[PDB]
Amino acid sequence: NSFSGYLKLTDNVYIKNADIVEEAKKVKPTVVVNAANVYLKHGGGVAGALNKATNNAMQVESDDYIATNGPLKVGGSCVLSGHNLAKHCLHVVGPNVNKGEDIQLLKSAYENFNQHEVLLAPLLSAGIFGADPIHSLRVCVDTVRTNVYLAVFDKNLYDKLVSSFL
Numbered sequence: 001n002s003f004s005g006y007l008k009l010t011d012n013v014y015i016k017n018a019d020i021v022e023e024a025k026k027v028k029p030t031v032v033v034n035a036a037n038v039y040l041k042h043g044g045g046v047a048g049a050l051n052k053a054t055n056n057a058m059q060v061e062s063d064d065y066i067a068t069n070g071p072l073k074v075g076g077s078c079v080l081s082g083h084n085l086a087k088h089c090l091h092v093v094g095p096n097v098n099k100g101e102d103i104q105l106l107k108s109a110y111e112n113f114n115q116h117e118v119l120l121a122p123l124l125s126a127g128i129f130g131a132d133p134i135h136s137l138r139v140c141v142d143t144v145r146t147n148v149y150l151a152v153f154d155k156n157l158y159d160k161l162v163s164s165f166l
């Protein structure tokens with residue numbers, strides 16, 4: 001869990017302009033967080049980048065879990081293997097705002113982080129799921145009590161998040 005180069009936003013939330021995959025390779029964290037959907041079908045954002053970095057081992061494990069146990073709930077999570085990226089991957093489902101799921105469920109989604117002392121994580125629902133990134137960051141800061149290291153890959157977005165936090 002060696003995090004370096006992060007900006008301190010609050011006493012327990014830190015942020016860095018980086019690819020979450022590269023950070024996981026360099027930090028070797030106990031938990032990396034994936035922004036998932038309820039079927040753990042890993043798509044065009046963080047999820048597909050994590051899965052590719054595991055040479056599809058994440059998708060095979062995910063398909064098996066879902067076939068055996070059923071889909072997650074929006075706002076829910078499950079802990080699976082971190083493969084070569086981390087010890088554990090916490091798959092969390094934020095609301096899909098573009099499809100009319102309730103943005104209030106973003107608070108439930110972030111509450112999952114509180115079961116883990118330290119996490120490398122992305123901003124939930126702020127990419128393919130269409131939530132406002134600044135709002136996602138505020139919900140994270142207000143909800144999460146454990147230590148969270150956020151990795152934001154796009155520089156223009158990182159800059160806009162940091163400044164709105166002045």
Ligand SMILES: Nc1ncnc2c1ncn2[C@@H]1O[C@H](COP(=O)(O)OP(=O)(O)OC[C@H]2O[C@@H](O)[C@H](O)[C@@H]2O)[C@@H](O)[C@H]1O
Nearest residue numbers: 019020035037042043044045046047125126127128129153
């Ligand atoms: N490699 C990356 N590293 C860091 N941040 C990234 C990366 N790729 C995207 N992001 C940023 O992570 C945040 C989350 O974006 P998404 O991964 O698209 O997550 P989400 O909005 O929750 O959508 C989830 C949906 O996308 C699919 O990948 C997934 O299977 C699910 O259906 C966004 O701010 C996005 O810009």
